[PDB]
């Protein structure tokens, strides 16, 4: 059977990076050589495998992760990277085997006056394990005084909303990301 990639890339709404979606696909066939030469993708970097020879390999399941970040944070979706996204939102392994696809979505995810639906994790006591998802909204205890779920001093909501306006810079404009990882 064919890989339902149209439901992932051409999806109308993407998830926030702190709650990145994952689509588990069950051993299908797809023309990966068609997706590479598509001008819709401004970022397409594969690690451990070449984009053209993907149709020449087999696997048990291919995982399709999807989220939205700003332009400057696209460089973090790569093995051995650090930052607010790579540490507290989405982390790829150092030995990552797959591809990183991204495209500008200012015409889709930016609203005049700001689209604040997409969020990211700003505070976390430790970095994320590879392919880990942290969706907890517990109040971040920055000091020694506990918070009791009440925002205030030394008590911060661990998430912050992206300010996606059409007039923002490309590094701050929304970029939809899709990561393909394989399982042998």
């Amino acid at each position: 059977n064919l890989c339902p990639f149209g439901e992932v890339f051409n999806a109308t709404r993407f998830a926030s990076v702190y709650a990145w979606n994952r689509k588990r696909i069950s051993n299908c066939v797809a023309d990966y050589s068609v997706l590479y030469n598509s001008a819709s993708f401004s970022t397409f970097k594969c690690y451990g495998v070449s984009p053209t020879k993907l149709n020449d390999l087999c696997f048990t399941n291919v995982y399709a992760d999807s989220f939205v970040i700003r332009g400057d944070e696209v460089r973090q979706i790569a093995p051995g990277q650090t930052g607010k996204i790579a540490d507290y939102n989405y982390k790829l392994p150092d030995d990552f085997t797959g591809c990183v696809i991204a495209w500008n979505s200012n015409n889709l995810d930016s609203k005049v006056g700001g689209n604040y639906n997409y969020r990211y994790r700003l505070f976390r006591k430790s970095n994320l394990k590879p392919f880990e998802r942290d969706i907890s909204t517990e109040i971040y205890q920055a000091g020694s005084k506990p918070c009791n779920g009440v925002e205030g001093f030394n008590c911060y909501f661990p998430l912050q909303s992206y300010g996606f306006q059409p007039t923002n810079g490309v590094g701050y404009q929304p970029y939809r990301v899709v990561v393909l990882s394989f399982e042998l």
Partner: antibody
Amino acid sequence: QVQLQQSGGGLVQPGGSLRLSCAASGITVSVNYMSWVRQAPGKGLEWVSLIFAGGSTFYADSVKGRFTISRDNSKNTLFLHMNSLRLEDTAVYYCARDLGPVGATDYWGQGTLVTVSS
Amino acid sequence: DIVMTQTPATLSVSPGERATLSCRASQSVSSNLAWYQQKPGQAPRLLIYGASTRATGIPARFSGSGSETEFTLTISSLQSEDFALYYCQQYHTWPPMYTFGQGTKVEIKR
């Protein structure tokens, strides 16, 4: 209380090493974004380095390869190891906790001076 | 880096009058800007964050405004304790860094 007491500054010959301390009170260093800001005498403020609560470290292009930020959770003290110092690095160094859009850079250290001469 | 330009470099105001300080960013920083007051020989003190939100314990005479590339710090009635250097700071590049303005010196007019 909320306090960022510093120490370790003084005179250092160009090219040597010097380590600054930033003892924290009430604020946990291992749980916050902790930065190092230096201010050249008579100039503006310049961000030097920053460590994440998760252990990630970032440095400015003017101190890359020469400076190293670290911390000690037992003593609850932020540190900054300065190597290969030159006449540039002569400034008053501050340490501060950063909150971004949740309070900016609210609390600062009192400042320790680093003088580089021969 | 995003360059922050404060105007004027020096502002001579009498006590009780209004002091207005501007700070322009070379690129859009939305509302991610903070203001600080630094007295001689002392560490900076946060006055405004989020372009307009007063920090805890800051008198009501201080107020911030502006967005994107233009920002303003206003002291409605200048007091004798308010004569110091003032710095703006963008933190739209906070995921790692941040930049300050060159500073504005508020001094007693004569």
